Amino acid sequence: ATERTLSIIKPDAVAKNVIGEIESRFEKAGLKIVAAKMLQLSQEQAEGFYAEHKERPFFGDLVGFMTSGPVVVQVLEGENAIAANRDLMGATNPKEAEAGTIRADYAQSIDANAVHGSDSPESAAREIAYFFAESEICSR
Amino acid sequence: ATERTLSIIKPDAVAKNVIGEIESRFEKAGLKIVAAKMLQLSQEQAEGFYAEHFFGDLVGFMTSGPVVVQVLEGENAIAANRDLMGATNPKEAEAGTIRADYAQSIDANAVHGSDSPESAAREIAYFFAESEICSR
């Protein structure tokens, strides 16, 4: 059945002005943007969201980047969306993503990998709540 | 000059999931999405926004479903957004313009766009706080 997952278009993608194309990959895969907003995270906001990695070697560098510029945080909804959005995205590391994946077409380095998406139902619920209030989401 | 303008992707376009295609239109035209949010407009919100004004029809459509409100920035953005959208009525908009390509009627014309400098500032400020617009 249908589900909702969190997707972030990251600073690097935002700065390349490729929001439309990426957004079209989602839409044309059958997923619908049911909640979205552009913003710039703060040191604290980035750290809250990525708390899971709070003691890994790239945490400091990740926070830096996810806060370095604006992003489009958004909720994608559709049939089996969590798994779907992962298929669209490709490997976290761009040099491993099959051709045609957002991460392979729009990014070079794992630092600046274009997009984020949730990896499970449990993190999908957590992440959506982090950035959106239920009344903000306009299921359609 | 580098101006800003208000853009809305109206319910009809959002309903058919073409947010990508229209967004790519602006970006490729040289415009930049410098602030955005999806949201369902309430009665007052729509009436509030359409302050300088069939009215009951406009309001009715503009609230029939979710929309994406946003600020576009870049050289001559206000009129470029206009030349891009095409004529307000799609039954007359030149081929290629957003409205001809996505729009059915003048009642559901896919997009909206600050019609002037004075209308832009008003329109932008109504939906967005300055701190939600991050130029680049």
* Domain spans in chain A, listed from the N-terminal domain onward: 1-140
Cα dihedral across residues B38, B26, B22, B101: positive or negative: positive
Environment class of B131 (CB within 10 Å of its CB; exposed 0-12, middle 13-18, buried 19+): exposed
Q: Please state the separation of Cα B15 from the chain's center in Å.
A: 15
The answer to whether B20 faces chain A, any CB pair under 8 Å, is yes
Nearest one of A80, A102, A82, A105 to A90, comparing CA atoms: A102
Which of B52, B61, B42 has its CA nearest to residue B114?
B52
| Range A121-124, long-range pairs (CB < 8 A, 24+ positions) | A121/A3, A121/A82, A123/A52, A124/A3, A124/A4, A124/A5, A124/A6, A124/A82
Q: Would you call A28 an interface residue with chain B, using a CB distance cutoff of 8 Å?
A: yes
Q: Does B15 touch chain A (CB under 8 A)?
A: yes
Interface probe with A: pick from B17, B33, B67, B71, most Cβ of A within 10 Å: B17
3-class DSSP state for residue B11?
helix
Cβ–Cβ < 8 Å for B112, B8: yes
CB environment A38-76: b (16+ within 10 A), e (fewer) = bbbbeeebbbebbeeeeeeeebeebbebbbbebbbbbbb
Residue in chain B lying closest to A16 (CA) = B27
- Separation of CA A27 from chain center: 15
Of B52, B100, B33, B84, the closest CA to residue A39 belongs to: B33
Residue A59: name the closest of A67, A48, A47, A69 by CA.
Answer: A47
- CA separation for the pair B73, B34 (Å, rounded): 6
CA nearest neighbour of A11 among A84, A93, A101, A106: A106
- CA atoms of B110 and A15, how far apart (whole Å): 25
Residue among B89, B68, B75 nearest B10 (CA): B68
State the nearest Cα–Cα gap between B70 and chain A, in angstroms.
Answer: 9
The CATH H-level superfamily of A1-140 is Nucleoside diphosphate kinase-like domain (3.30.70.141)
CB B48 within 8 A of CB B60: no
Contacts for A39 with CB less than 8 Å, ≥ 6 apart:
A70, A71, A73, B132, B134
Cβ–Cβ pairs < 8 A, chains A and B: 80
Residue at token pair 């809250």: A48
Contact (Cβ atoms closer than 8 angstroms) between residue A128 and residue A75: yes
Angle at which helices A81-89 and A19-28 cross, to 10°: 130
Cα distance between residue A61 and residue A68, in whole Å: 10
**Resolution of the PDB structure in angstroms:** 2.5
Cα separation, A62 vs A65, in Å, equals 5
Beta strands in B10-126 (DSSP E): 32-39, 67-75, 111-113
* Superfamily name and number for B1-136: Nucleoside diphosphate kinase-like domain (3.30.70.141)
How are the residues of chain A apportioned to helix, strand and coil, as percentages rounded to the nearest 5? Answer: 45, 20, 35
Q: Which residues of B touch A88 (CB under 8 A)?
A: none
Give the count of beta carbons closer than 10 Å to the beta carbon of residue B112.
19
Residue A8 C-alpha, separation from nearest chain B C-alpha, in angstroms: 14
| Residues of chain B with C-beta less than 8 angstroms from the C-beta of A20 | 19-28
**How close does chain B come to A70, measured CA to CA in Å?**
7
Query: Closest Cα partner for B27 from A20, A68, A131, A88?
Result: A20
Cβ contact A27–B17 (<8 Å): yes
Q: Scan residues 32-61 of B and list those with Cβ closer than 8 Å to A.
A: 32-40
Active site annotation includes B112: yes
Catalytic residue among B90, B112, B120, B127: B112
Rounded Cα–Cα distance for residues B9 and B122 (Å):
18
The tokens of B104 are what? 């059915």
B108 contacts: CB under 8 Å, gap ≥ 6: B10, B11, B12, B61
